[PDB]
Amino acid sequence: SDVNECLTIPEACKGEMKCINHYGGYLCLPRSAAVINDLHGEGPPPPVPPAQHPNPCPPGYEPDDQDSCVD
């Protein structure tokens, strides 16, 4: 939320990640899997990551960035 205020709707889950498709379908998954850098392997991470978001949600359903200023 850059220009967005605390008026947003709780259509995202607190403690769970928001997995949505390009059609608008909504899903929530356990926050056990963190949305971090690419897991291409161990040791050195690449200068250009092939995945800015791990996509723990089945391909087609992309993780949405949930930024809230209040409950």
Swiss-Prot record:
Localization per record: Secreted, Extracellular space, Extracellular matrix; Secreted, Extracellular space, Extracellular matrix, Basement membrane
Q: Which residues form the EGF-like domain?
A: 2-29
SS bond partners: C6-C69, C13-C28, C19-C57
Q: How is the protein modified post-translationally, according to the record? A: N-glycosylated; contains mostly complex-type glycans. Not O-glycosylated. Cleaved by ELANE; produces a 50-55 kDa fragment. Cleaved by MMP2 and MMP9; produces several fragments.
Membrane-spanning regions, if any? none
Site positions for Cleavage: V35, I36, D38, L39, H40, G41
Recorded disease: Cutis laxa, autosomal recessive, 1B: A connective tissue disorder characterized by loose, hyperextensible skin with decreased resilience and elasticity leading to a premature aged appearance. Face, hands, feet, joints, and torso may be differentially affected. The clinical spectrum of autosomal recessive cutis laxa is highly heterogeneous with respect to organ involvement and severity. ARCL1B features include emphysema, lethal pulmonary artery occlusion, aortic aneurysm, cardiopulmonary insufficiency, birth fractures, arachnodactyly, and fragility of blood vessels.
| Biological function | Plays a crucial role in elastic fiber formation in tissue, and in the formation of ultrastructural connections between elastic laminae and smooth muscle cells in the aorta, therefore participates in terminal differentiation and maturation of smooth muscle cell (SMC) and in the mechanical properties and wall integrity maintenance of the aorta. In addition, is involved in the control of collagen fibril assembly in tissue throught proteolytic activation of LOX leading to cross- linking of collagen and elastin.
Assembly and partners are described as: Homodimer; disulfide-linked. Multimer; allows heparin binding. Monomer. Interacts with FBN1 (via N-terminal domain); this interaction inhibits EFEMP2 binding to LOX and ELN. Interacts with LOX (via propeptide); this interaction is strong and facilitates formation of ternary complexes with ELN during elastic fiber assembly; this interaction limits interaction of EFEMP2 with FBLN5. Interacts with PITX2. Interacts with ELN with moderate affinity; this interaction regulates ELN self-assembly maturation stage. Interacts with FBLN5 with moderate affinity.
Protein family according to the UniProt entry: Belongs to the fibulin family.
Question: What is the protein's name according to its record?
Answer: EGF-containing fibulin-like extracellular matrix protein 2
Q: Which organism is it from?
A: Homo sapiens (Human)
